[PDB]
From Swiss-Prot:
It comes from Saccharomyces cerevisiae (strain YJM789). This is ATP-dependent rRNA helicase SPB4. Component of pre-60S ribosomal complexes. ATP binds at residues 48-55. It is found in: Nucleus, Nucleolus. Belongs to the DEAD box helicase family. DDX55/SPB4 subfamily.
RNA sequence: GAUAAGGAUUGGCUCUAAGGGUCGGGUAGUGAGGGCCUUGGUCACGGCCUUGGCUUGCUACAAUUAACGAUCAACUUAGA
């Protein structure tokens, strides 16, 4: 059908509003076959052509899971996060973060906010600045490259126990021989019982 | 001992945390401060009150590959 209205789990009104303002005029086959399952207690391994709605395909289920598990509430603890997103290059992670910000533009007020933080290797911010504003702003989404997110997670001030969603974009590149050393540690730190999406 | 070698001309892959600290960018206009001047009254070369002409601030165009440069501080042969 490729219609947003007739999907299995009736996407949230603000996510639907963001989709309509952005458009796409419909949902692509990737987003039609991945969103129902990645939010439905199934890990996902997705192969698709470039520019086929993959980024939204793994961003919408992330927000759905964040809202579903009561991550956007006062009950959520400090120095904890919900979802992690990993990409092999800094520009790709920044672009993913921009997409997430665009989706969160239409997030309603009068509720506990949902935020994201980008963790890339930069000369404008040490890892301790990242820890400081992570503690202050309390986001639920982390997006970054393997090196800086590994350094961030290794800091004792950050607790990974509440994470329930890991996404690896360009997962063939992140499981490459060069990247496997860092990603093995990154996944070693995080809890095993989780939902994984490789794209 | 990592990093392709170890008498030779050593410089050696892509992406991915950090790689000692610090400082520094133009040309123009007008306000400010200092410096040399100078002009009157005033008190025995020196004060007092007044008159007209290197640092920094605000605006207007180039540069944003400063992806450069400067300075301070560290360091020596793992071979038997």
């Amino acid at each position: 059908s490729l219609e947003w209205d007739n999907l299995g789990f009736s996407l949230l009104p603000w996510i639907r509003t963001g989709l309509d303002v952005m458009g796409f005029e419909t949902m692509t086959p990737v987003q039609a076959s991945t969103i129902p399952m990645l939010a439905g207690n199934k890990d996902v391994v997705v192969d698709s052509v470039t520019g086929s709605g993959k980024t939204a395909a793994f961003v919408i289920p992330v927000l759905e899971k964040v809202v579903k598990e009561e991550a956007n509430t006062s009950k959520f603890k400090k120095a904890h996060f919900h979802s992690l997103i990993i990409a092999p290059t800094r520009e790709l992670s920044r672009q993913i973060e921009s997409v997430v910000l665009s989706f969160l533009e239409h997030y309603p007020s009068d509720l506990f906010p949902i935020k994201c933080q980008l963790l890339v290797g930069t000369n404008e911010a040490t890892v301790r600045d990242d820890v400081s504003n992570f503690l202050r702003n309390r986001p639920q989404i982390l997006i970054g490259t393997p090196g800086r997110v590994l350094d961030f997670l290794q800091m004792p001030a950050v607790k990974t126990s509440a994470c329930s969603m890991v996404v690896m974009d360009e997962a063939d590149r992140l499981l490459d021989m060069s990247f496997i050393k860092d990603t093995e540690k990154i996944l070693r730190l995080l809890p095993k019982q989780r939902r994984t999406g490789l794209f």
